[PDB]
Every structure is written in structure tokens, then in C-alpha cells.
Amino acid sequence: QPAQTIPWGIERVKAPSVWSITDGSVSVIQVAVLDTGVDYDHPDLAANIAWCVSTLRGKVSTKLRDCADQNGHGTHVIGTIAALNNDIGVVGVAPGVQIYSVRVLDARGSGSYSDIAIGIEQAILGPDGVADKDGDGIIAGDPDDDAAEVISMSLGGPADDSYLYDMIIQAYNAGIVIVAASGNEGAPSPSYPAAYPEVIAVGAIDSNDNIASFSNRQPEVSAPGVDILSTYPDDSYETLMGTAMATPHVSGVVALIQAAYYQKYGKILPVGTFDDISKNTVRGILHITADDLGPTGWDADYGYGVVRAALAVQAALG
Amino acid sequence: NTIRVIVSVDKAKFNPHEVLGIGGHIVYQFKLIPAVVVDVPANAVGKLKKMPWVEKVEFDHQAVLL
Ligand SMILES: [Ca+2]
Ligand SMILES: [Ca+2]
Ligand SMILES: [Ca+2]
Ligand SMILES: [Ca+2]
Ligand SMILES: [Ca+2]
Ligand SMILES: [Ca+2]
Ligand SMILES: [Ca+2]
Ligand SMILES: [Zn+2]
């Protein structure tokens, strides 16, 4: 195992200075990562893997075997959010956050919309299988429930299907922040589900603060997505690019925001909207604390700009 | 021969035992939205479409890692 390094992306989104306040280890907070599965015993990840489930072929399985990563993408994404802060490997944006690994993509890195939709339902239901156990309407942020607070989707397709959107809406109404990759075709707008209003579309920047040429345009925010070093199977590390790599940076930020807010107030922030520029919503905070690159204001390349954990947490607690 | 589709249903007219009648079977019943994933013969799409408890039938699309 190599000595721990802090990847440039984690530095860029200003995560390290937040860890004194929180590293995301607030017990009510989980981040659900709907991806190719996870190297569940990776030494730099294991302690944060709270649930390992699969929805492939429409069958919900917790067999560690069916939930393990046979591609690597999932493992990499998860490491960007939640790699442990220790003596080895790398470190995530939120190095103590609990992860739900929801395997909705197969070894090829492809997935059925149906499997993804089932995946979103599992993120809401949690291990107990019930969305709202005590029937109070509170799901995300209710300590009596085991719903995720963030749903992270480093994947996308061109179809807009009503059932998948209906599930997205269910997540949003459960108070869950949904984050998704904008896509890698250099297209004028994001793929689905990133293009839904209830989801945060994420574009990718490189280490020179330029937008990646492949990054789908008109995202909400942007984050590091070129030359991104993270965990990879088996118990190893690898460097990859994509809007799939940018997305977990954002999810990590959101995890920090909700953890820090819950630590201080015993509640989480509302999700908010694309237009929000206030301090009273996660997305509002994301937008007003982002590093505004390119032309002043929101723009087609960077969205509102590059997410900044340190500033977003300050805004949340102030 | 078989295809997987996702059917949005009218819960007032749906019972999962209705699927067998058109040659299909249920893969997954959603708990949070009124929909079911079903496997059906490919030439049975039109027939499904015309069923009273069917509000929409959608093919199962593909997403890819980014
Ligand atoms: Ca939770
Ligand atoms: Ca391993
Ligand atoms: Ca580490
Ligand atoms: Ca639950
Ligand atoms: Ca509740
Ligand atoms: Ca409650
Ligand atoms: Ca700008
Ligand atoms: Zn079947």
C-alpha cells in the first residue's frame, strides 16, 4: 500500500480545511453511489462501506459477491467521495462519510434504466426496506430512518423516461440531493438524469481550471474531472477522466454541508433549485460559494463554477 | 422472443396477476411509484398497450458509465 497523497482534485474543491469541522462522519448521513459496485474490502474504503447492494437484472441482492465491482468505475467514484484519511492511498472529499454502494451498472459499465430506477428506490428505502418508518414525512435527515441524503450518479443516457423521472421526483421529495454527471460527448446540454431540474448536473474541469473538451455543456456546477487519481480494484489505485470523476467531488461537498448542518442544528438543509442563490438551500449554497470561472456568472461551460467545500460549509453554518 | 419493458399502471385497475394473461411475467414491482418491470413476448407490446390498467409502456433504455 503506498503512502497517502491528497489528489489535486480534493485540494481544488477545498476539502481539507473542512475536516476539522466535519469529515462527514455524522451518523444520520449516508451517500448512495449508483454505479458499477465496489471493491468492498479495499483497505482505503472498507470502513466507510455501510451497505453494499445490487439491482442488476431487476433483482435486489446484498450478496457481497453480486455487489462487488467488476469494472472499477464505482470503486474510483466512491474513493473520490469517501477514501479514508489515514496513512495510505488517497483521501475523499468527505473521508468519514458512510457509503451505500448500489450496483446498477454491470461489468461493461452499462446499465438498464430499470435497474437504475430500482437503485434510486433502494437509496430511499435503505436497508430496512421502508422509506418513512415513523410516517412523519421526514426521510432524508430523519435519524429514525436509514434513507440516503445524497444520491450520486456518474452515469447517463439520452432517453427521458417518465417512470425514471417519477422515481427522481420521489427522491427529491424525500429531501435527498441528487447529483449526476453531465456527460462526455461535448454536447450542448446534459444527458439524463443530470438534465432534470431536480438533479445537479456536473461538468468537468482540468488541472489548469479549463473546462474539459468532452464535458457536456450547461451544467449546474463543475468540478475536477481530468487526471483524477482514486481507488481502483483490487485494493489498488488508478487515474481516470470524465464527468463521472467530477460528480463525486460535488456529492462529497453536499455530504459535508448536510453533515455540518446536522451536527450544529439537528436538521438538514432543503435541496433547493437551479435558480437558488440564497444561503438557505444546499443548491443555493453550492451556487453562491462556487469559484466563478470563465465569464462572470453562470455560464455554459462551468455552470455556476467550481464547488468549494470550505466556503459552502461556512455559508451553511454562519 | 422476449423483451423487458416498464409499465406505468393505474393502480385502480392493476393486479400483478394480470400480466401472465398476456404471456408475461413480473420482474419487479416498485414500492414508490405505480410501475412494474415485466418481461413479455416482443409481439405483445401492442396488446399490452391496449390494456385498461396500462397507462404507459416504455422500453428499457441504456445508460453508460461517464
Ligand atoms: Ca440518512
Ligand atoms: Ca479488494
Ligand atoms: Ca487514505
Ligand atoms: Ca428505510
Ligand atoms: Ca420518518
Ligand atoms: Ca421521524
Ligand atoms: Ca462563470
Ligand atoms: Zn424474465
Side-chain angles (χ1 to χ4, degrees), chain A residues 218-234:
Chain A
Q218 297 187 78
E220 188 166 333
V221 290
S222 48
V226 180
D227 298 319
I228 302 304
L229 173 66
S230 187
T231 46
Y232 212 65
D234 183 15

mmCIF file with all atom_site columns, all heavy atoms in Angstrom, chain A residues 218-234:
data_model
loop_
_atom_site.group_PDB
_atom_site.id
_atom_site.type_symbol
_atom_site.label_atom_id
_atom_site.label_alt_id
_atom_site.label_comp_id
_atom_site.label_asym_id
_atom_site.label_entity_id
_atom_site.label_seq_id
_atom_site.pdbx_PDB_ins_code
_atom_site.Cartn_x
_atom_site.Cartn_y
_atom_site.Cartn_z
_atom_site.occupancy
_atom_site.B_iso_or_equiv
_atom_site.pdbx_formal_charge
_atom_site.auth_seq_id
_atom_site.auth_comp_id
_atom_site.auth_asym_id
_atom_site.auth_atom_id
_atom_site.pdbx_PDB_model_num
ATOM 1   N N   . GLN A 1 218 ? -23.763 23.390 -20.354 1.00 0.00 ? 218 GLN A N   1
ATOM 2   C CA  . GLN A 1 218 ? -24.838 23.840 -19.492 1.00 0.00 ? 218 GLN A CA  1
ATOM 3   C C   . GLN A 1 218 ? -25.055 23.077 -18.177 1.00 0.00 ? 218 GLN A C   1
ATOM 4   O O   . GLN A 1 218 ? -26.193 22.665 -17.900 1.00 0.00 ? 218 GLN A O   1
ATOM 5   C CB  . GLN A 1 218 ? -26.123 23.864 -20.292 1.00 0.00 ? 218 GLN A CB  1
ATOM 6   C CG  . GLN A 1 218 ? -26.080 24.841 -21.450 1.00 0.00 ? 218 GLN A CG  1
ATOM 7   C CD  . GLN A 1 218 ? -27.446 24.988 -22.146 1.00 0.00 ? 218 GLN A CD  1
ATOM 8   O OE1 . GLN A 1 218 ? -28.307 25.693 -21.611 1.00 0.00 ? 218 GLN A OE1 1
ATOM 9   N NE2 . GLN A 1 218 ? -27.603 24.426 -23.270 1.00 0.00 ? 218 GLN A NE2 1
ATOM 10  N N   . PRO A 1 219 ? -23.987 22.754 -17.467 1.00 0.00 ? 219 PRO A N   1
ATOM 11  C CA  . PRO A 1 219 ? -24.150 22.048 -16.198 1.00 0.00 ? 219 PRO A CA  1
ATOM 12  C C   . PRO A 1 219 ? -24.562 23.047 -15.141 1.00 0.00 ? 219 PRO A C   1
ATOM 13  O O   . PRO A 1 219 ? -24.579 24.264 -15.379 1.00 0.00 ? 219 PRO A O   1
ATOM 14  C CB  . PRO A 1 219 ? -22.734 21.506 -15.929 1.00 0.00 ? 219 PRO A CB  1
ATOM 15  C CG  . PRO A 1 219 ? -21.844 22.661 -16.474 1.00 0.00 ? 219 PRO A CG  1
ATOM 16  C CD  . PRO A 1 219 ? -22.547 22.961 -17.809 1.00 0.00 ? 219 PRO A CD  1
ATOM 17  N N   . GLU A 1 220 ? -24.814 22.571 -13.929 1.00 0.00 ? 220 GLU A N   1
ATOM 18  C CA  . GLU A 1 220 ? -25.112 23.431 -12.814 1.00 0.00 ? 220 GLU A CA  1
ATOM 19  C C   . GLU A 1 220 ? -23.859 23.945 -12.140 1.00 0.00 ? 220 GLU A C   1
ATOM 20  O O   . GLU A 1 220 ? -23.786 25.104 -11.742 1.00 0.00 ? 220 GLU A O   1
ATOM 21  C CB  . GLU A 1 220 ? -26.047 22.724 -11.826 1.00 0.00 ? 220 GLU A CB  1
ATOM 22  C CG  . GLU A 1 220 ? -26.626 23.559 -10.653 1.00 0.00 ? 220 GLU A CG  1
ATOM 23  C CD  . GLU A 1 220 ? -27.782 22.881 -9.955  1.00 0.00 ? 220 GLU A CD  1
ATOM 24  O OE1 . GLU A 1 220 ? -28.448 22.091 -10.621 1.00 0.00 ? 220 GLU A OE1 1
ATOM 25  O OE2 . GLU A 1 220 ? -28.013 23.131 -8.743  1.00 0.00 ? 220 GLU A OE2 1
ATOM 26  N N   . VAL A 1 221 ? -22.894 23.043 -11.918 1.00 0.00 ? 221 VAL A N   1
ATOM 27  C CA  . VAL A 1 221 ? -21.623 23.330 -11.383 1.00 0.00 ? 221 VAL A CA  1
ATOM 28  C C   . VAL A 1 221 ? -20.565 22.491 -12.032 1.00 0.00 ? 221 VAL A C   1
ATOM 29  O O   . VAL A 1 221 ? -20.905 21.633 -12.875 1.00 0.00 ? 221 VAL A O   1
ATOM 30  C CB  . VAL A 1 221 ? -21.583 23.086 -9.824  1.00 0.00 ? 221 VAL A CB  1
ATOM 31  C CG1 . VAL A 1 221 ? -22.428 24.147 -9.060  1.00 0.00 ? 221 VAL A CG1 1
ATOM 32  C CG2 . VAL A 1 221 ? -22.025 21.589 -9.514  1.00 0.00 ? 221 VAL A CG2 1
ATOM 33  N N   . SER A 1 222 ? -19.312 22.686 -11.672 1.00 0.00 ? 222 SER A N   1
ATOM 34  C CA  . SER A 1 222 ? -18.283 21.900 -12.312 1.00 0.00 ? 222 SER A CA  1
ATOM 35  C C   . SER A 1 222 ? -17.291 21.514 -11.216 1.00 0.00 ? 222 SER A C   1
ATOM 36  O O   . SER A 1 222 ? -17.349 21.980 -10.113 1.00 0.00 ? 222 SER A O   1
ATOM 37  C CB  . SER A 1 222 ? -17.649 22.681 -13.535 1.00 0.00 ? 222 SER A CB  1
ATOM 38  O OG  . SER A 1 222 ? -17.322 24.006 -13.099 1.00 0.00 ? 222 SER A OG  1
ATOM 39  N N   . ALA A 1 223 ? -16.476 20.537 -11.515 1.00 0.00 ? 223 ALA A N   1
ATOM 40  C CA  . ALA A 1 223 ? -15.542 20.010 -10.583 1.00 0.00 ? 223 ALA A CA  1
ATOM 41  C C   . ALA A 1 223 ? -14.449 19.232 -11.328 1.00 0.00 ? 223 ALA A C   1
ATOM 42  O O   . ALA A 1 223 ? -14.543 18.945 -12.520 1.00 0.00 ? 223 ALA A O   1
ATOM 43  C CB  . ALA A 1 223 ? -16.291 19.160 -9.492  1.00 0.00 ? 223 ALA A CB  1
ATOM 44  N N   . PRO A 1 224 ? -13.364 18.928 -10.624 1.00 0.00 ? 224 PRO A N   1
ATOM 45  C CA  . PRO A 1 224 ? -12.242 18.193 -11.181 1.00 0.00 ? 224 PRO A CA  1
ATOM 46  C C   . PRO A 1 224 ? -12.611 16.871 -11.837 1.00 0.00 ? 224 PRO A C   1
ATOM 47  O O   . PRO A 1 224 ? -13.183 15.963 -11.208 1.00 0.00 ? 224 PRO A O   1
ATOM 48  C CB  . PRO A 1 224 ? -11.280 17.992 -9.960  1.00 0.00 ? 224 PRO A CB  1
ATOM 49  C CG  . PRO A 1 224 ? -11.648 19.125 -9.069  1.00 0.00 ? 224 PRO A CG  1
ATOM 50  C CD  . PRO A 1 224 ? -13.119 19.291 -9.258  1.00 0.00 ? 224 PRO A CD  1
ATOM 51  N N   . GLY A 1 225 ? -12.230 16.721 -13.112 1.00 0.00 ? 225 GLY A N   1
ATOM 52  C CA  . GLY A 1 225 ? -12.585 15.523 -13.833 1.00 0.00 ? 225 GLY A CA  1
ATOM 53  C C   . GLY A 1 225 ? -11.600 15.022 -14.898 1.00 0.00 ? 225 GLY A C   1
ATOM 54  O O   . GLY A 1 225 ? -11.927 14.233 -15.786 1.00 0.00 ? 225 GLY A O   1
ATOM 55  N N   . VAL A 1 226 ? -10.384 15.523 -14.799 1.00 0.00 ? 226 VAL A N   1
ATOM 56  C CA  . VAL A 1 226 ? -9.310  15.095 -15.691 1.00 0.00 ? 226 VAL A CA  1
ATOM 57  C C   . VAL A 1 226 ? -8.136  14.755 -14.838 1.00 0.00 ? 226 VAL A C   1
ATOM 58  O O   . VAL A 1 226 ? -7.884  15.505 -13.928 1.00 0.00 ? 226 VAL A O   1
ATOM 59  C CB  . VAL A 1 226 ? -8.896  16.210 -16.621 1.00 0.00 ? 226 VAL A CB  1
ATOM 60  C CG1 . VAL A 1 226 ? -7.776  15.718 -17.530 1.00 0.00 ? 226 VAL A CG1 1
ATOM 61  C CG2 . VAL A 1 226 ? -10.136 16.698 -17.367 1.00 0.00 ? 226 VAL A CG2 1
ATOM 62  N N   . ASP A 1 227 ? -7.459  13.625 -15.148 1.00 0.00 ? 227 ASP A N   1
ATOM 63  C CA  . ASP A 1 227 ? -6.347  13.087 -14.374 1.00 0.00 ? 227 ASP A CA  1
ATOM 64  C C   . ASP A 1 227 ? -6.662  12.887 -12.873 1.00 0.00 ? 227 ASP A C   1
ATOM 65  O O   . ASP A 1 227 ? -5.991  13.464 -12.015 1.00 0.00 ? 227 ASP A O   1
ATOM 66  C CB  . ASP A 1 227 ? -5.187  14.032 -14.486 1.00 0.00 ? 227 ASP A CB  1
ATOM 67  C CG  . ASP A 1 227 ? -4.687  14.182 -15.922 1.00 0.00 ? 227 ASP A CG  1
ATOM 68  O OD1 . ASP A 1 227 ? -4.607  13.144 -16.666 1.00 0.00 ? 227 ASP A OD1 1
ATOM 69  O OD2 . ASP A 1 227 ? -4.447  15.334 -16.374 1.00 0.00 ? 227 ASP A OD2 1
ATOM 70  N N   . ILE A 1 228 ? -7.741  12.177 -12.565 1.00 0.00 ? 228 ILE A N   1
ATOM 71  C CA  . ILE A 1 228 ? -8.228  12.046 -11.207 1.00 0.00 ? 228 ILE A CA  1
ATOM 72  C C   . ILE A 1 228 ? -7.785  10.698 -10.685 1.00 0.00 ? 228 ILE A C   1
ATOM 73  O O   . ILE A 1 228 ? -8.188  9.697  -11.178 1.00 0.00 ? 228 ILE A O   1
ATOM 74  C CB  . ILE A 1 228 ? -9.811  12.117 -11.088 1.00 0.00 ? 228 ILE A CB  1
ATOM 75  C CG1 . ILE A 1 228 ? -10.284 13.458 -11.684 1.00 0.00 ? 228 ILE A CG1 1
ATOM 76  C CG2 . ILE A 1 228 ? -10.189 11.892 -9.592  1.00 0.00 ? 228 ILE A CG2 1
ATOM 77  C CD1 . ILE A 1 228 ? -9.667  14.698 -11.098 1.00 0.00 ? 228 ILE A CD1 1
ATOM 78  N N   . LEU A 1 229 ? -6.903  10.772 -9.715  1.00 0.00 ? 229 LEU A N   1
ATOM 79  C CA  . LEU A 1 229 ? -6.352  9.577  -9.025  1.00 0.00 ? 229 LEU A CA  1
ATOM 80  C C   . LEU A 1 229 ? -7.309  9.169  -7.861  1.00 0.00 ? 229 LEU A C   1
ATOM 81  O O   . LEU A 1 229 ? -7.733  10.027 -7.074  1.00 0.00 ? 229 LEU A O   1
ATOM 82  C CB  . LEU A 1 229 ? -5.026  9.937  -8.408  1.00 0.00 ? 229 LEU A CB  1
ATOM 83  C CG  . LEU A 1 229 ? -4.452  8.805  -7.532  1.00 0.00 ? 229 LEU A CG  1
ATOM 84  C CD1 . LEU A 1 229 ? -4.108  7.651  -8.382  1.00 0.00 ? 229 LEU A CD1 1
ATOM 85  C CD2 . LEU A 1 229 ? -3.317  9.322  -6.721  1.00 0.00 ? 229 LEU A CD2 1
ATOM 86  N N   . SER A 1 230 ? -7.704  7.910  -7.836  1.00 0.00 ? 230 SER A N   1
ATOM 87  C CA  . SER A 1 230 ? -8.541  7.399  -6.780  1.00 0.00 ? 230 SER A CA  1
ATOM 88  C C   . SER A 1 230 ? -8.316  5.915  -6.610  1.00 0.00 ? 230 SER A C   1
ATOM 89  O O   . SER A 1 230 ? -7.464  5.266  -7.280  1.00 0.00 ? 230 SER A O   1
ATOM 90  C CB  . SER A 1 230 ? -10.063 7.726  -7.091  1.00 0.00 ? 230 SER A CB  1
ATOM 91  O OG  . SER A 1 230 ? -10.904 7.402  -6.021  1.00 0.00 ? 230 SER A OG  1
ATOM 92  N N   . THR A 1 231 ? -9.133  5.327  -5.739  1.00 0.00 ? 231 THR A N   1
ATOM 93  C CA  . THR A 1 231 ? -9.153  3.878  -5.539  1.00 0.00 ? 231 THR A CA  1
ATOM 94  C C   . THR A 1 231 ? -9.653  3.146  -6.735  1.00 0.00 ? 231 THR A C   1
ATOM 95  O O   . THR A 1 231 ? -10.502 3.613  -7.535  1.00 0.00 ? 231 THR A O   1
ATOM 96  C CB  . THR A 1 231 ? -10.034 3.550  -4.291  1.00 0.00 ? 231 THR A CB  1
ATOM 97  O OG1 . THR A 1 231 ? -11.276 4.286  -4.330  1.00 0.00 ? 231 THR A OG1 1
ATOM 98  C CG2 . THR A 1 231 ? -9.385  4.008  -3.052  1.00 0.00 ? 231 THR A CG2 1
ATOM 99  N N   . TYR A 1 232 ? -9.120  1.939  -6.903  1.00 0.00 ? 232 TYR A N   1
ATOM 100 C CA  . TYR A 1 232 ? -9.455  1.075  -8.021  1.00 0.00 ? 232 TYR A CA  1
ATOM 101 C C   . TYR A 1 232 ? -9.208  -0.371 -7.620  1.00 0.00 ? 232 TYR A C   1
ATOM 102 O O   . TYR A 1 232 ? -8.293  -0.658 -6.863  1.00 0.00 ? 232 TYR A O   1
ATOM 103 C CB  . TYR A 1 232 ? -8.523  1.397  -9.234  1.00 0.00 ? 232 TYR A CB  1
ATOM 104 C CG  . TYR A 1 232 ? -9.143  1.212  -10.553 1.00 0.00 ? 232 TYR A CG  1
ATOM 105 C CD1 . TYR A 1 232 ? -10.209 1.994  -10.967 1.00 0.00 ? 232 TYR A CD1 1
ATOM 106 C CD2 . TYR A 1 232 ? -8.665  0.287  -11.424 1.00 0.00 ? 232 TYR A CD2 1
ATOM 107 C CE1 . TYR A 1 232 ? -10.776 1.841  -12.181 1.00 0.00 ? 232 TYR A CE1 1
ATOM 108 C CE2 . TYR A 1 232 ? -9.236  0.115  -12.629 1.00 0.00 ? 232 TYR A CE2 1
ATOM 109 C CZ  . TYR A 1 232 ? -10.272 0.916  -13.052 1.00 0.00 ? 232 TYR A CZ  1
ATOM 110 O OH  . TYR A 1 232 ? -10.871 0.722  -14.327 1.00 0.00 ? 232 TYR A OH  1
ATOM 111 N N   . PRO A 1 233 ? -9.916  -1.277 -8.193  1.00 0.00 ? 233 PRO A N   1
ATOM 112 C CA  . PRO A 1 233 ? -9.703  -2.672 -7.798  1.00 0.00 ? 233 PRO A CA  1
ATOM 113 C C   . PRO A 1 233 ? -8.398  -3.206 -8.343  1.00 0.00 ? 233 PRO A C   1
ATOM 114 O O   . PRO A 1 233 ? -7.932  -2.724 -9.338  1.00 0.00 ? 233 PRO A O   1
ATOM 115 C CB  . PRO A 1 233 ? -10.871 -3.379 -8.420  1.00 0.00 ? 233 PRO A CB  1
ATOM 116 C CG  . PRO A 1 233 ? -11.875 -2.227 -8.805  1.00 0.00 ? 233 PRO A CG  1
ATOM 117 C CD  . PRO A 1 233 ? -10.944 -1.111 -9.215  1.00 0.00 ? 233 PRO A CD  1
ATOM 118 N N   . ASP A 1 234 ? -7.784  -4.171 -7.683  1.00 0.00 ? 234 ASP A N   1
ATOM 119 C CA  . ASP A 1 234 ? -8.222  -4.710 -6.396  1.00 0.00 ? 234 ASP A CA  1
ATOM 120 C C   . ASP A 1 234 ? -7.266  -4.223 -5.371  1.00 0.00 ? 234 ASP A C   1
ATOM 121 O O   . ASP A 1 234 ? -6.024  -4.471 -5.441  1.00 0.00 ? 234 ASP A O   1
ATOM 122 C CB  . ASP A 1 234 ? -8.207  -6.222 -6.404  1.00 0.00 ? 234 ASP A CB  1
ATOM 123 C CG  . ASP A 1 234 ? -8.731  -6.803 -5.090  1.00 0.00 ? 234 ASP A CG  1
ATOM 124 O OD1 . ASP A 1 234 ? -9.385  -6.065 -4.232  1.00 0.00 ? 234 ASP A OD1 1
ATOM 125 O OD2 . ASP A 1 234 ? -8.530  -8.022 -4.858  1.00 0.00 ? 234 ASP A OD2 1
#
